[PDB]
Design an enzyme around this catalytic site. Sequence first.
Site, PDB file in Angstrom:
ATOM      1  N   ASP A   1      20.916  -7.740 -55.727  1.00  0.00           N
ATOM      2  CA  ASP A   1      21.304  -9.125 -55.685  1.00  0.00           C
ATOM      3  C   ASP A   1      22.032  -9.420 -56.977  1.00  0.00           C
ATOM      4  O   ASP A   1      22.216  -8.519 -57.795  1.00  0.00           O
ATOM      5  CB  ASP A   1      20.156 -10.110 -55.361  1.00  0.00           C
ATOM      6  CG  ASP A   1      19.250 -10.404 -56.495  1.00  0.00           C
ATOM      7  OD1 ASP A   1      19.241  -9.437 -57.349  1.00  0.00           O
ATOM      8  OD2 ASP A   1      18.632 -11.459 -56.631  1.00  0.00           O
TER       9      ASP A   1
ATOM     10  N   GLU B   1      23.854 -15.355 -46.442  1.00  0.00           N
ATOM     11  CA  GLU B   1      23.334 -14.137 -47.027  1.00  0.00           C
ATOM     12  C   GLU B   1      24.052 -12.859 -46.616  1.00  0.00           C
ATOM     13  O   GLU B   1      23.960 -11.838 -47.297  1.00  0.00           O
ATOM     14  CB  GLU B   1      21.786 -14.015 -46.832  1.00  0.00           C
ATOM     15  CG  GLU B   1      20.987 -15.217 -47.362  1.00  0.00           C
ATOM     16  CD  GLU B   1      20.697 -15.171 -48.829  1.00  0.00           C
ATOM     17  OE1 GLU B   1      21.093 -14.065 -49.377  1.00  0.00           O
ATOM     18  OE2 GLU B   1      20.125 -16.055 -49.441  1.00  0.00           O
TER      19      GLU B   1
END
Length: 162
Positions: A20, A11
Amino acid sequence: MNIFEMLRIDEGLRLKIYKDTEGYYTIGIGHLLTKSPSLNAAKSELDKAIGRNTNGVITKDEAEKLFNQDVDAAVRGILRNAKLKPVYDSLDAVRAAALINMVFQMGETGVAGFTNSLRMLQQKRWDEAAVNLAKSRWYNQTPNRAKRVITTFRTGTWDAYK
């Protein structure tokens, strides 16, 4: 190595609000803030989360903290989830992290939809599971992550991460 280290790799760490790959306001280590297009909304969700007025900026510790909650939540869902649990239960310390990595990334529901792969895992049919997981959208879309996680289920080692 462990789930935290693994996900931190997958991540990355961002201390400033980012979007995102679906365009969702995010922060830290994959912490989704909101599915609202409103930046005001995500900033507000953040302050709420942090316990202070952040202005869309957090510290490494605040991130680590949300990270910890997120991981815990992912484990709980697996456990509350009926398709998931039995799989989690059949997996070793290592392959269990891989499963968790997927839940964290796609959510309970999301992961529970890999019907064939899940039974294959359940059956310890690694390679085959692997063979099949590679045939997903998920993998096509996030091949870098997907690959690592797949290698993880297949080998039961951290190699893809070393």
